[PDB]
Design a protein around this ligand. Structure first.
Ligand SMILES: Nc1ncnc2c1ncn2[C@@H]1O[C@H](CSCCNC(=O)NCc2ccccc2)[C@@H](O)[C@H]1O
Ligand SMILES: Nc1ncnc2c1ncn2[C@@H]1O[C@H](CSCCNC(=O)NCc2ccccc2)[C@@H](O)[C@H]1O
Lengths: 315, 315
């Protein structure tokens, strides 16, 4: 989509992503501490951006790195690779991974940073799975290989009031009809871990080696173990990223609220009707994640909890 | 423009603007403390958004309020006015102020919140001046009536290094070619007032009663009185808003770094080549503000200082 690749044309998003130390050091450590994965191999960097994953792979001893991006950032990547004198190892190709012509039939390794808010926002894993099905050699590997999504309950009456009740009295005037636009929009924000009132519950496990495209729309029945008697005002979502297959030095990071903040923050679903929970309670709910019918890069999250159902949107 | 009015269709920008207490209380105080300006008058709210200025004017005793917005937010304004039982005083009209049909020939008062980053970003004052020339009755008033733009010198080597030098060494790789995209982009951020190294210099005075459209593209020769021997790394811009004409209770707010933060923050122009200044020095420069030839809602700021010239863009 023209709007989608246009946004990634600007250096601003690439600066934010590169300055995310948890993200950037995790990939750096994965590659530098497992050079047996890259030594003398053919590597495909899907959505290479500025191209630093391709340069990591070269440093780790890749025979050949193919960096692919549809964004205009690829022209910056070309200059960056030339500035670093790596043009004999790294080839950059402008286009969608779905339609570009590659100068090889097969690659030994696919690496990518495809993750959106709540993991699946932007639907870029579909592109990586296209690349894997078409190009990954027999016995090849895709990294990161394992991803999880988790939910956790939140009590934060003040944050709820600031976003919702706010619209009841604005300098004496009623603006209550605005609440209808607010509730269905998922909020991307850093969550104070003091406001967590449950143990986390895993709602999705993905292995990029065995997952199909169709698996990326899913339902889960979840149980949240309530740890604090309180008013439940929201459910928050986050994701964990693992580098595992054939690793001597496994790497993990979490985007959860108990972990150092990343640029992905946490995804918060505000409850239209907050409700009381008790420590020890097993809170049962159902969550379904779909691609938005209108824009398949946008997500729909359907949440059933406390005998009420709300659908939330990520952009 | 479709992109422009689309952005103002979402409640998010209206929430941010309404929660800016300095902005919102300034307009509230102006209207509530000068009701003689509104009593039994016909009022035009140009770009009414959620419509709360129209409701302020009604409370202050307006005979008739016409709220105009091209954005889809106008449908929310219609519901808000009905919820407050003000539909007999306030009429909302969907369209551009340049082309809508008004049910009156003339209005006594125009009120608007048209100000962008560095005052003139988005070029919405052109629309307010259209409305004034077409609709303002003989002896009518436009608010806010007086605006200034100021510049101030900054020393912040660390912030400069974080935005510019950062690209020289990214995990051992050279990304110096990215600096070319960064320098020309004006930064909108809250400036630490401890990093100011000059007295402010006014570069523009606008009275909305007498200013022409053509006056909104301007040049100024400025002098910054340096107060701290230091490395000058940036020039910051901000603006002041006055309610004056026929006021018994005059109202002012500043978006400057010595004042409480607003959603407009400050506009920062990073210098490609920081240079040394001395306390007592009279630093002479020239600044020109133009509409972007490609998109006239975008600004071009041409800065000459220390015998070097850089053009900066606001989106
Ligand atoms: N179908 C597609 N075909 C081709 N390109 C596509 C497609 N879908 C999306 N894209 C691009 O994918 C990127 C995603 S954002 C990651 C940038 N890469 C990056 O920082 N690498 C360095 C790095 C450093 C440390 C840790 C991780 C990564 C954008 O540039 C999109 O334009
Ligand atoms: N040519 C045009 N014709 C018609 N509408 C146009 C045109 N150019 C821009 N617009 C609209 O102008 C608004 C600017 S943003 C201020 C919203 N109003 C607001 O908060 N009022 C309440 C308030 C409270 C306290 C203090 C001040 C204000 C947007 O909604 C645009 O869609």
């Amino acid at each position: 989509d023209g709007v989608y690749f246009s946004s990634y044309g600007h250096y601003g998003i690439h600066e934010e992503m590169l300055k995310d130390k948890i993200r950037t050091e995790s990939y750096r450590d994965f590659i530098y501490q497992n050079p047996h994965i890259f030594k003398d191999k053919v590597v495909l960097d899907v959505g290479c951006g500025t191209g630093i994953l391709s340069m990591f792979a070269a440093k780790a001893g890749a025979k050949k790195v193919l960096g692919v991006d549809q964004s205009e950032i690829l022209y910056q990547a070309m200059d960056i690779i030339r500035l670093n004198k790596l043009e004999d190892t790294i080839t950059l190709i402008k286009g969608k991974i779905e339609e570009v012509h590659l100068p090889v039939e097969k690659v030994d390794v696919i690496i990518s940073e495809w993750m959106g808010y709540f993991l699946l926002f932007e639907s870029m894993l579909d592109s990586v799975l296209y690349a894997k099905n078409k190009y990954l050699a027999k016995g090849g590997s895709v990294y990161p290989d394992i991803c999880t999504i988790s939910l956790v309950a939140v009590s934060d009456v003040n944050k709820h009031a600031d976003r919702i009740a706010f619209w009841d009295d604005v300098y004496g005037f009623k603006m209550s009809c605005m609440k209808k636009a607010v509730i269905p929009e998922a909020v991307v924000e850093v969550l104070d871990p003091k406001t967590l009132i449950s143990e986390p519950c895993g709602i999705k496990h993905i292995d990029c080696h065995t997952t199909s495209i169709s698996d990326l729309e899913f339902s889960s029945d979840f149980t949240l173990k309530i740890t604090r008697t309180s008013m439940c005002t929201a459910i928050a979502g986050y994701f964990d990223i693992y580098f595992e297959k054939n690793c001597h030095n496994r790497v993990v990071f979490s985007t959860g609220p108990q972990s150092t903040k990343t640029h992905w923050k946490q995804t918060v679903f505000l409850l239209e009707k907050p409700f009381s929970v008790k420590a020890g309670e097993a809170l049962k709910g159902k969550v379904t994640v779909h691609k938005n019918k209108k824009d398949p890069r946008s997500l729909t999250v359907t949440l059933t909890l406390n005998n009420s159902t709300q659908t939330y949107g990520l952009q």
